[PDB]
């Protein structure tokens, strides 16, 4: 029973799931059957929802809020949800190199935005 | 035998120091069960079997220490 | 301690008398309200069946 | 009251061990749980051994409650020799806690016997 | 799918999100921004739903 | 005089076990006070586990005090 | 030997004060931190702190009676 | 002889209770300092429970020190 | 002997002080298993196998310390 709905399309929609190893704000947690109501935020990681057997879909979520209701309902509301095969390895290396050179080189919000983008690009490249 | 009678009373006093582990052990299992029964889920099952079986195992240290103190 | 125990128990018995009479309204006095509601519903069903 | 409490508690402890042994003659199936090793036979500090420790709680609670109530003789000589009104409030709180301890001790004895009846039929 | 009506949706501020009745029922971190972050995120989410429905 | 001197020290060293019984009564009450403010464990529910759990932790101090006062 | 053992009985029995002293602070730490979560103020948490402190302080009063009885009786 | 030497030991072992009274003032101050930054328990409210709770925890140190000074 | 009989009673009382570690060890594993099972769903397996194996390792200290007390 998962309700992973994004702001453009619905993935889980209906309650037809079991396990959901989605990355929250703390660590790489995983929702089981009737988990506790933990409405914590989600970070940019890998939201692999194990459907019964080994039919897990590696959905590379960019962050959001994993709301857990008291009636065994996991509403993982994120911004984006793309698969692991939808990211080319050639274009992923160009974005990480441009963010590292722009970091600690200017002022205002240029150095702050480049530091957060380098951490999300390094975690997605190691899970390919 | 003055030396045998003096050691009998001291044997029941130093052996009673082990009640700190048995007294705090019954409260450690009750503190974690009371804070977990208020949310997800009830208290008549699941955690009810662990609290009854867990309290009997932690209280076994107090029964063994009290038997050697009363026999000396 | 005998005089202090009799004075303390007299005050606790007075508060428990009002608590026992109040708690009986949901069991002893509630049976009369439940039987009156069941008799009123049975009278409407008997009048509808006879009509 | 002290000698009668220990003798009555010993008879209730022996009935719990005899009832579990009679019901295990048609089911048995051991009494412990399986694991990855084999050291559950040495930890036989329950069932039969737990009946002597559970029955001793009734006799130990009667001795501790009687010792607190009998301490008023040593405190009465000092108050009749600060104000003495502090002894009336302390004796009333100890008498209320001793009377309320009988309900907690009776519920703890009934909760221990309920786990033995459910485990013997499973 | 033919007619419409003018509705309205309220948005709480940062001082009203933390002063709810059952706001402490979820495991929220008190060190980081949890009350001010959840209040500002509801304004952008309601603006997108009102613009899509409008 | 050796038997009378050991009787007075038997009730002093045996009272060291009050640290577990004293802190055990407060450990069970600290978790019940912090959990009752999360809505809405008040009447019964958590009140029965706190009263029954406090009697188990107090059994260690009551049994240890009987051996010290029997001298 | 009888008079020398009476003075040591009131000193070794005072080791149990660590449980009674730390018990009053353990119950007060949970009540102060829980009251700031809105709004356990009037009664509720305030009434349980007075009744809960009497159970933790019962170990210190019972242990002190055995130490004072050896020096006077 | 025996009564004079036992008077010095009556105030040494009885001073072991300072660990409970010393750590009690820090446990109540740690929860009050960390809870005051959550807005806005400042005047009264949390200040009354911390002041009254510190006096009750300090009673164990003053009561244990009376038996040490009476025998020394 | 008077000196041999006096040391036998003091050996069984001093060895009983180790019950605080064995009594609190059974409660530490039971507190984490009761609160950990409420987060779903390791109840009859996974965490159930580690609780039975973990309790046997902590109980080995109490059985080894009690053997030297009864033999002295």
XYZ file of C-alpha atoms in Angstrom:
715
model
C 0.000 0.000 0.000
C 1.931 2.991 -1.356
C 0.808 6.361 -2.716
C 3.944 7.724 -4.407
C 2.351 10.522 -6.445
C 4.487 13.275 -7.965
C 3.398 16.743 -9.155
C 2.979 15.673 -12.782
C 2.122 11.962 -12.790
C 1.185 9.121 -10.446
C 3.466 6.116 -9.941
C 1.915 3.986 -7.198
C -1.534 5.649 -7.169
C -3.525 2.618 -6.027
C -2.582 0.543 -2.978
C -0.756 -2.377 -4.595
C 2.731 -2.501 -3.042
C 4.526 -3.978 -0.035
C 8.049 -2.642 0.542
C 9.377 0.806 -0.349
C 13.065 1.569 0.276
C 12.898 5.307 -0.359
C 15.640 7.707 0.805
C 14.241 10.067 3.437
C 15.945 13.024 5.145
C 17.833 10.905 7.696
C 19.121 7.657 6.203
C 18.188 5.018 3.617
C 15.022 3.849 5.347
C 12.417 1.422 4.053
C 8.674 1.177 4.648
C 7.427 -2.326 5.470
C 3.758 -3.289 6.124
C 2.078 -1.157 8.811
C 4.894 1.206 9.732
C 4.742 4.021 12.285
C 3.455 7.462 11.210
C 6.711 9.194 10.231
C 5.982 12.199 8.007
C 9.620 13.082 7.308
C 11.052 14.820 4.263
C 12.812 13.044 1.401
C 16.271 13.752 0.001
C 17.729 13.222 -3.494
C 18.381 9.483 -3.546
C 17.076 6.195 -4.957
C 13.449 5.316 -4.203
C 13.345 1.580 -4.955
C 9.916 0.166 -4.066
C 10.171 -3.621 -3.770
C 6.876 -4.964 -5.158
C 6.262 -8.331 -3.468
C 9.219 -10.208 -4.971
C 12.300 -8.686 -6.591
C 10.336 -6.380 -8.898
C 11.837 -3.189 -7.477
C 11.943 -0.101 -9.708
C 14.984 2.117 -9.149
C 13.230 5.505 -9.228
C 15.817 8.282 -8.868
C 13.823 10.787 -6.808
C 15.131 14.345 -6.481
C 13.654 14.890 -3.012
C 10.294 15.607 -1.439
C 8.307 14.439 1.586
C 7.605 10.804 2.495
C 4.334 11.047 4.418
C 3.275 7.915 6.317
C -0.363 7.786 7.408
C -1.620 5.780 10.405
C -3.672 3.392 8.257
C -0.664 1.742 6.584
C -0.455 4.323 3.793
C 2.894 5.609 2.501
C 2.494 8.790 0.429
C 5.993 9.458 -0.942
C 5.353 12.862 -2.491
C 8.425 13.936 -4.473
C 9.112 16.448 -7.229
C 10.641 14.173 -9.882
C 10.705 10.392 -10.317
C 12.851 9.055 -13.166
C 14.302 5.560 -13.660
C 17.963 4.598 -13.580
C 18.042 3.887 -17.331
C 16.777 7.399 -18.180
C 20.129 9.006 -17.250
C 23.018 8.743 -19.699
C 26.508 8.238 -18.284
C 28.084 10.677 -20.762
C 25.853 13.641 -19.874
C 26.051 12.896 -16.140
C 29.815 13.529 -16.067
C 29.478 16.946 -17.731
C 27.076 18.282 -15.088
C 29.321 17.224 -12.190
C 32.404 18.880 -13.707
C 30.667 22.222 -14.307
C 29.228 22.354 -10.778
C 32.616 21.732 -9.142
C 34.373 24.536 -11.039
C 31.606 27.067 -10.335
C 31.610 26.309 -6.596
C 33.667 28.600 -4.341
C 34.294 30.980 -7.249
C 31.660 33.744 -6.974
C 29.251 35.164 -4.385
C 25.525 35.576 -3.600
C 23.715 32.232 -4.171
C 26.110 31.000 -6.874
C 28.407 29.153 -4.459
C 25.526 27.828 -2.342
C 23.607 26.343 -5.282
C 26.720 24.698 -6.752
C 27.580 22.920 -3.487
C 24.176 21.243 -3.174
C 24.191 20.149 -6.831
C 27.589 18.446 -6.526
C 26.394 16.203 -3.681
C 23.304 14.977 -5.546
C 25.276 14.251 -8.731
C 27.879 12.144 -6.905
C 25.302 9.872 -5.252
C 23.423 9.172 -8.496
C 26.590 8.316 -10.440
C 27.724 5.725 -7.877
C 24.360 3.889 -7.989
C 24.446 3.158 -11.727
C 33.038 -20.048 66.303
C 33.172 -16.250 66.260
C 34.762 -16.107 62.796
C 32.080 -18.316 61.223
C 29.193 -16.300 62.679
C 30.696 -12.967 61.599
C 31.037 -14.081 57.966
C 27.437 -15.337 57.818
C 25.899 -11.906 58.438
C 28.287 -10.213 55.995
C 27.430 -12.731 53.265
C 23.802 -11.580 53.081
C 24.753 -7.878 52.874
C 27.335 -7.769 50.071
C 25.255 -10.187 47.980
C 22.267 -7.807 48.100
C 24.130 -5.221 45.981
C 22.972 -6.978 42.803
C 19.439 -5.603 43.146
C 20.386 -2.511 41.116
C 20.510 -4.533 37.895
C 17.295 -6.432 38.570
C 15.356 -3.373 39.732
C 16.380 -1.169 36.808
C 15.965 -4.036 34.338
C 12.223 -4.336 34.922
C 11.822 -0.575 34.431
C 13.894 -0.429 31.231
C 11.586 -2.864 29.431
C 8.499 -1.044 30.729
C 9.739 2.397 29.655
C 10.354 1.353 26.043
C 7.024 -0.494 25.853
C 4.941 2.383 27.241
C 6.457 4.875 24.787
C 5.881 2.538 21.831
C 2.307 1.535 22.628
C 1.051 5.118 22.212
C 1.662 5.057 18.438
C 1.686 2.011 16.128
C -0.172 0.206 17.451
C -2.075 -1.413 20.326
C -0.852 -2.994 23.569
C -2.818 -6.263 23.915
C -0.582 -8.194 21.488
C 2.792 -8.011 19.711
C 4.568 -5.972 22.394
C 2.486 -7.640 25.134
C 4.235 -11.003 24.624
C 7.682 -9.401 24.626
C 7.044 -7.411 27.817
C 5.833 -10.455 29.766
C 8.651 -12.722 28.564
C 11.293 -9.995 28.818
C 10.473 -9.155 32.434
C 10.864 -12.778 33.558
C 14.333 -13.112 32.009
C 15.677 -9.924 33.617
C 14.289 -10.917 37.037
C 16.266 -14.186 37.063
C 19.386 -12.408 38.352
C 17.592 -11.260 41.504
C 16.406 -14.756 42.411
C 19.888 -16.282 42.122
C 21.532 -13.592 44.269
C 18.846 -13.791 46.972
C 19.186 -17.578 47.299
C 22.898 -17.464 48.167
C 22.357 -14.648 50.687
C 19.646 -16.425 52.696
C 21.617 -19.701 52.747
C 24.706 -18.129 54.356
C -1.863 7.162 63.641
C -5.247 5.644 64.526
C -6.954 9.043 64.725
C -5.315 10.279 61.515
C -6.358 7.149 59.601
C -10.022 7.511 60.587
C -10.141 11.166 59.507
C -8.468 10.479 56.158
C -10.672 7.497 55.353
C -13.840 9.484 56.112
C -12.982 12.080 53.463
C -12.105 9.409 50.891
C -15.364 7.538 51.534
C -17.374 10.714 50.905
C -15.733 11.291 47.518
C -16.084 7.607 46.593
C -19.810 7.621 47.414
C -20.461 10.283 44.764
C -18.149 8.442 42.339
C -19.887 5.102 42.847
C -23.323 6.671 42.355
C -22.130 8.510 39.245
C -20.494 5.453 37.703
C -23.677 3.416 38.264
C -25.597 5.707 35.891
C -23.828 4.031 32.948
C -24.755 0.512 34.114
C -27.543 0.414 36.704
C -29.507 3.496 35.633
C -28.536 2.917 31.990
C -30.428 -0.395 31.974
C -33.706 1.428 32.647
C -33.017 3.862 29.796
C -32.073 0.993 27.492
C -35.157 -1.042 28.378
C -37.411 1.989 27.871
C -35.907 2.625 24.430
C -36.311 -1.039 23.463
C -39.924 -1.077 24.673
C -40.709 2.091 22.705
C -39.175 0.612 19.549
C -41.055 -2.663 20.053
C -44.336 -0.782 20.524
C -43.872 1.058 17.220
C -43.045 -2.224 15.472
C -46.091 -3.935 16.986
C -48.356 -1.042 15.974
C -46.953 -1.108 12.432
C -47.432 -4.878 12.150
C -51.014 -4.653 13.428
C -51.813 -1.799 11.033
C 0.754 -13.372 59.591
C 4.353 -13.742 58.431
C 4.490 -17.529 58.813
C 1.020 -17.996 57.295
C 1.864 -15.901 54.226
C 4.920 -17.923 53.250
C 3.119 -21.254 53.716
C 0.092 -20.223 51.642
C 2.289 -18.862 48.835
C 4.244 -22.126 48.592
C 1.084 -24.126 47.864
C 0.068 -21.802 45.021
C 3.507 -22.067 43.411
C 3.466 -25.869 43.333
C 0.061 -25.955 41.617
C 1.375 -23.908 38.682
C 4.246 -26.337 38.058
C 2.028 -29.413 38.365
C -0.621 -28.089 35.984
C 1.935 -27.367 33.250
C 3.483 -30.839 33.536
C 0.113 -32.610 33.312
C -0.966 -30.699 30.190
C 2.360 -31.432 28.456
C 1.755 -35.210 28.528
C -0.446 -34.996 25.412
C 1.355 -32.252 23.450
C 4.818 -31.503 24.885
C 6.626 -30.044 21.844
C 9.382 -28.770 24.178
C 8.841 -25.251 25.578
C 11.620 -23.104 24.054
C 12.239 -21.564 20.627
C 14.752 -22.595 17.998
C 17.837 -20.613 17.052
C 21.200 -21.030 15.267
C 22.979 -22.708 18.206
C 22.156 -25.153 21.028
C 22.411 -23.502 24.455
C 18.732 -23.280 25.455
C 18.915 -26.392 27.677
C 21.268 -24.804 30.208
C 18.948 -21.797 30.711
C 16.301 -23.719 32.640
C 15.625 -20.806 35.004
C 11.940 -20.590 34.017
C 8.708 -22.623 34.178
C 9.656 -24.831 37.128
C 12.295 -22.452 38.505
C 10.092 -19.408 37.843
C 7.354 -20.730 40.147
C 9.578 -20.436 43.229
C 10.636 -16.877 42.365
C 7.103 -15.698 41.549
C 5.646 -17.154 44.755
C 8.407 -15.532 46.845
C 7.233 -12.052 45.823
C 4.087 -12.417 47.942
C 6.046 -13.305 51.076
C 8.698 -10.639 50.522
C 6.103 -7.890 50.029
C 4.398 -8.757 53.326
C 7.673 -8.513 55.262
C 8.606 -5.139 53.748
C 5.138 -3.667 54.331
C 5.083 -4.818 57.965
C 8.533 -3.339 58.632
C 7.448 0.112 57.429
C 4.335 0.125 59.611
C 6.223 -1.095 62.682
C 8.688 1.820 62.439
C 6.182 4.184 64.088
C 7.350 3.089 67.550
C 10.840 4.535 67.031
C 9.475 7.807 65.619
C 6.883 8.292 68.383
C 9.551 8.708 71.062
C 11.294 11.534 69.210
C 8.090 13.471 68.471
C 6.983 13.387 72.133
C 10.390 14.381 73.545
C 10.966 21.157 64.798
C 7.221 20.532 64.865
C 5.792 17.040 65.237
C 3.162 17.512 62.517
C 5.527 16.122 59.848
C 5.013 12.583 61.218
C 1.248 12.648 60.607
C 1.619 13.424 56.892
C 4.306 10.784 56.359
C 2.345 8.047 58.119
C -0.772 8.800 56.054
C 1.136 8.535 52.769
C 2.768 5.246 53.787
C -0.586 3.775 54.838
C -2.199 4.758 51.529
C 0.681 3.248 49.541
C 0.592 0.003 51.537
C -3.150 -0.452 50.994
C -2.839 0.289 47.268
C 0.061 -2.170 46.936
C -2.327 -5.093 47.480
C -4.140 -4.365 44.209
C -0.876 -4.119 42.258
C 0.463 -7.329 43.814
C -2.749 -9.230 43.044
C -2.750 -8.073 39.414
C 0.907 -9.051 38.979
C 0.216 -12.558 40.300
C -2.721 -13.033 37.922
C -0.678 -11.769 34.966
C 2.081 -14.313 35.645
C -0.373 -17.232 35.722
C -1.985 -16.126 32.446
C 1.289 -16.500 30.531
C 1.775 -20.062 31.798
C -1.709 -21.150 30.695
C -1.329 -19.705 27.187
C 2.152 -21.170 26.651
C 1.094 -24.651 27.796
C -1.656 -24.826 25.141
C 0.512 -23.528 22.277
C -17.007 20.587 -17.965
C -19.139 23.550 -19.033
C -19.538 25.901 -16.059
C -17.317 26.964 -13.173
C -17.434 28.796 -9.846
C -15.030 31.075 -7.950
C -13.569 29.184 -4.988
C -10.927 30.131 -2.416
C -8.182 28.271 -0.561
C -6.429 29.516 2.603
C -2.702 29.328 3.266
C -1.227 29.119 6.756
C 1.871 31.049 7.809
C 4.905 29.841 9.799
C 3.341 30.844 13.115
C 0.140 28.877 12.405
C 1.722 25.639 11.149
C 3.537 24.924 14.429
C 0.535 25.938 16.584
C -1.795 23.177 15.353
C -3.546 20.601 17.561
C -1.907 17.376 16.382
C 1.268 18.933 14.970
C 3.543 16.898 17.275
C 2.162 13.531 16.117
C 4.809 13.160 13.383
C 8.558 12.715 13.865
C 9.673 16.246 12.992
C 13.192 17.530 13.621
C 13.253 20.583 15.888
C 16.819 21.561 14.933
C 16.295 22.161 11.210
C 13.583 24.292 9.610
C 10.396 22.208 9.796
C 7.682 24.770 10.645
C 8.887 27.535 8.333
C 9.714 25.094 5.523
C 6.346 23.311 5.519
C 4.471 26.629 5.643
C 6.318 28.190 2.698
C 5.982 25.006 0.627
C 2.176 25.090 0.906
C 2.002 28.499 -0.796
C 3.784 27.303 -3.942
C 1.773 24.066 -4.034
C -1.561 25.888 -3.743
C -0.540 28.429 -6.396
C 0.129 25.655 -8.915
C -3.211 23.962 -8.203
C -5.133 27.241 -8.477
C -3.403 28.186 -11.738
C -4.075 24.761 -13.268
C -7.732 24.811 -12.207
C -8.131 28.435 -13.290
C 31.170 -9.469 70.350
C 31.951 -10.707 66.841
C 28.376 -11.839 66.165
C 26.848 -8.556 67.365
C 29.244 -6.414 65.314
C 28.367 -8.211 62.066
C 24.623 -7.714 62.613
C 24.854 -3.911 62.464
C 26.900 -3.961 59.238
C 24.501 -6.418 57.598
C 21.774 -3.777 57.296
C 24.133 -1.086 55.951
C 25.788 -2.825 52.991
C 22.472 -4.423 51.975
C 20.889 -0.973 51.502
C 23.073 -0.276 48.448
C 20.417 -1.873 46.230
C 18.080 1.102 46.655
C 19.733 2.873 43.705
C 18.105 0.489 41.232
C 14.694 0.597 42.908
C 14.778 4.368 43.394
C 15.802 5.172 39.822
C 13.516 2.463 38.434
C 10.378 4.128 39.781
C 11.391 7.386 38.072
C 12.428 5.777 34.773
C 8.969 4.275 34.241
C 7.302 7.589 35.145
C 9.525 9.632 32.813
C 8.490 7.641 29.734
C 4.798 7.767 30.684
C 4.823 11.540 31.228
C 6.543 12.256 27.905
C 4.285 9.855 25.995
C 0.994 11.124 27.428
C 1.482 14.555 25.816
C 1.383 13.033 22.306
C -2.447 12.614 22.430
C -4.238 10.885 23.956
C -3.062 8.221 26.415
C -4.720 9.452 29.615
C -7.618 7.424 31.023
C -6.601 3.740 31.314
C -4.482 2.496 28.350
C -1.132 3.842 29.567
C -2.318 4.141 33.189
C -2.577 0.345 33.557
C 0.941 -0.355 32.270
C 2.470 2.332 34.497
C 0.817 1.003 37.664
C 1.651 -2.629 36.875
C 5.172 -1.810 35.686
C 6.011 0.108 38.858
C 5.153 -2.904 41.030
C 7.687 -5.101 39.221
C 10.533 -2.619 39.712
C 9.607 -2.106 43.380
C 9.785 -5.852 44.100
C 13.599 -5.785 44.117
C 13.765 -3.135 46.839
C 11.090 -4.784 48.977
C 12.763 -8.207 48.951
C 16.221 -6.765 49.655
C 14.930 -4.740 52.620
C 13.549 -7.849 54.347
C 16.980 -9.491 54.621
C 18.518 -6.365 56.181
C 15.780 -5.885 58.802
C 15.845 -9.566 59.841
C 19.151 -9.195 61.720
C 33.082 -4.113 68.849
C 29.408 -3.285 69.357
C 29.980 0.472 69.638
C 32.413 0.574 66.703
C 29.988 -1.214 64.363
C 27.160 1.234 65.126
C 29.005 4.205 63.606
C 29.787 2.326 60.380
C 26.152 1.272 59.964
C 24.988 4.854 59.405
C 27.709 5.542 56.801
C 27.591 2.484 54.525
C 23.777 2.630 54.392
C 23.905 6.135 52.860
C 25.106 4.750 49.511
C 21.487 4.475 48.349
C 21.102 8.255 48.119
C 22.337 8.220 44.507
C 19.108 6.590 43.319
C 16.844 8.957 45.234
C 18.776 12.062 44.186
C 18.918 11.158 40.495
C 15.290 9.999 40.523
C 13.957 13.469 41.310
C 15.902 14.905 38.363
C 14.865 12.157 35.932
C 11.158 12.794 36.516
C 11.664 16.573 36.335
C 13.584 16.417 33.042
C 10.757 14.627 31.221
C 8.109 16.959 32.669
C 9.985 20.144 31.735
C 10.728 18.958 28.191
C 7.185 17.678 27.649
C 5.486 20.850 28.880
C 7.161 22.959 26.168
C 5.481 20.904 23.411
C 2.090 22.648 23.968
C 0.235 22.475 26.220
C 0.737 20.243 29.282
C 0.609 23.012 31.877
C -2.462 22.970 34.126
C -2.759 19.527 35.771
C -2.065 16.547 33.462
C 1.737 16.662 33.574
C 1.854 18.944 36.632
C -0.356 16.617 38.708
C 1.597 13.471 37.791
C 4.913 15.058 38.808
C 3.838 15.422 42.448
C 2.492 11.866 42.699
C 5.342 10.380 40.663
C 8.018 11.947 42.869
C 6.632 10.238 45.986
C 7.360 6.779 44.557
C 10.996 7.587 43.748
C 11.542 9.284 47.124
C 10.208 6.264 49.038
C 13.519 4.429 48.595
C 15.488 7.233 50.251
C 13.211 7.509 53.283
C 13.158 3.751 53.921
C 16.941 3.419 53.598
C 17.546 6.357 55.955
C 15.492 4.741 58.734
C 17.828 1.740 58.941
C 20.898 3.985 59.224
C 19.441 6.226 61.947
C 18.181 3.283 64.024
C 21.695 1.853 64.427
C 23.003 5.090 65.989
C 20.092 5.579 68.423
C 18.643 2.122 69.129
C 39.939 3.396 70.970
C 37.210 1.555 69.072
C 34.631 4.333 69.462
C 37.100 7.082 68.510
C 38.346 5.346 65.350
C 34.800 4.587 64.166
C 33.840 8.278 64.284
C 36.132 9.152 61.366
C 34.740 6.341 59.199
C 31.158 7.477 59.844
C 31.677 10.649 57.793
C 33.770 9.130 54.976
C 31.472 6.406 53.626
C 28.394 8.572 54.258
C 29.689 11.206 51.806
C 29.240 8.815 48.852
C 25.730 10.183 48.273
C 27.059 13.403 46.744
C 27.088 11.791 43.286
C 23.287 11.672 43.207
C 22.816 15.211 44.495
C 25.575 16.657 42.312
C 24.353 15.066 39.082
C 20.739 15.905 39.942
C 21.294 19.649 39.594
C 22.883 19.138 36.160
C 20.180 16.810 34.814
C 17.432 19.327 35.586
C 19.509 22.194 34.164
C 20.244 20.332 30.919
C 16.556 19.819 30.118
C 15.683 23.419 31.023
C 18.442 24.945 28.879
C 17.636 22.773 25.854
C 13.884 23.306 26.246
C 14.022 27.095 26.575
C 15.410 27.463 23.033
C 12.242 25.925 21.535
C 10.269 29.187 22.111
C 9.119 30.524 24.435
C 9.256 29.108 27.975
C 11.184 31.874 29.740
C 9.420 33.808 32.503
C 7.695 31.400 34.935
C 6.136 28.331 33.209
C 9.313 26.252 32.907
C 11.288 28.401 35.372
C 8.964 27.399 38.235
C 9.404 23.655 37.694
C 13.192 23.942 37.389
C 13.520 25.988 40.588
C 11.210 23.697 42.571
C 12.720 20.537 41.087
C 16.264 21.571 41.988
C 15.352 22.013 45.664
C 13.805 18.537 45.893
C 16.830 16.864 44.294
C 19.207 18.772 46.591
C 17.456 17.422 49.705
C 19.337 14.115 49.422
C 22.711 15.835 49.776
C 21.690 17.895 52.806
C 20.083 14.938 54.596
C 23.085 12.660 54.022
C 25.503 15.344 55.250
C 23.692 15.636 58.596
C 24.633 12.091 59.623
C 28.280 12.717 58.691
C 28.595 15.918 60.742
C 26.838 14.427 63.786
C 29.501 11.697 64.130
C 32.523 13.906 63.382
C 39.388 -23.989 60.007
C 38.234 -20.536 61.099
C 40.127 -18.621 58.399
C 39.054 -21.007 55.625
C 35.371 -20.868 56.591
C 35.363 -17.063 56.829
C 36.766 -16.628 53.310
C 34.171 -18.977 51.790
C 31.209 -16.833 52.864
C 32.848 -13.607 51.660
C 33.645 -15.147 48.273
C 30.023 -15.982 47.481
C 28.868 -12.487 48.473
C 31.505 -10.577 46.498
C 30.891 -12.703 43.388
C 27.169 -11.843 43.471
C 27.910 -8.195 42.618
C 28.231 -9.159 38.943
C 24.475 -9.688 38.606
C 24.005 -6.025 37.640
C 25.612 -6.578 34.236
C 23.738 -9.794 33.469
C 20.384 -8.454 34.661
C 20.625 -5.207 32.699
C 21.898 -7.052 29.621
C 18.681 -9.023 29.173
C 16.675 -5.789 29.446
C 18.797 -3.845 26.941
C 18.112 -6.376 24.182
C 14.420 -6.569 25.123
C 13.985 -2.782 25.028
C 15.388 -2.486 21.499
C 13.356 -5.467 20.262
C 10.069 -4.107 21.632
C 10.578 -0.637 20.142
C 12.111 -1.960 16.920
C 9.232 -4.319 16.132
C 6.728 -1.433 16.193
C 8.273 0.083 13.038
C 7.165 -2.959 10.939
C 7.611 -5.781 10.404
C 10.305 -7.918 12.044
C 8.242 -9.721 14.699
C 8.298 -13.505 14.149
C 11.547 -13.488 12.134
C 14.605 -11.332 11.380
C 14.695 -9.536 14.736
C 13.240 -12.602 16.490
C 16.328 -14.686 15.639
C 18.816 -12.073 16.876
C 16.953 -11.575 20.168
C 17.173 -15.270 21.069
C 20.846 -15.515 20.091
C 21.746 -12.181 21.689
C 20.167 -13.054 25.036
C 22.224 -16.251 25.319
C 25.507 -14.346 24.966
C 24.623 -11.830 27.690
C 23.441 -14.606 30.031
C 26.811 -16.390 29.863
C 28.364 -13.837 32.230
C 25.814 -14.551 34.961
C 26.190 -18.331 34.801
C 30.001 -18.242 34.869
C 30.124 -15.827 37.818
C 27.589 -17.853 39.824
C 29.636 -21.055 39.487
C 32.588 -19.651 41.449
C 30.308 -18.403 44.243
C 28.609 -21.748 44.929
C 31.941 -23.617 44.801
C 33.610 -21.413 47.439
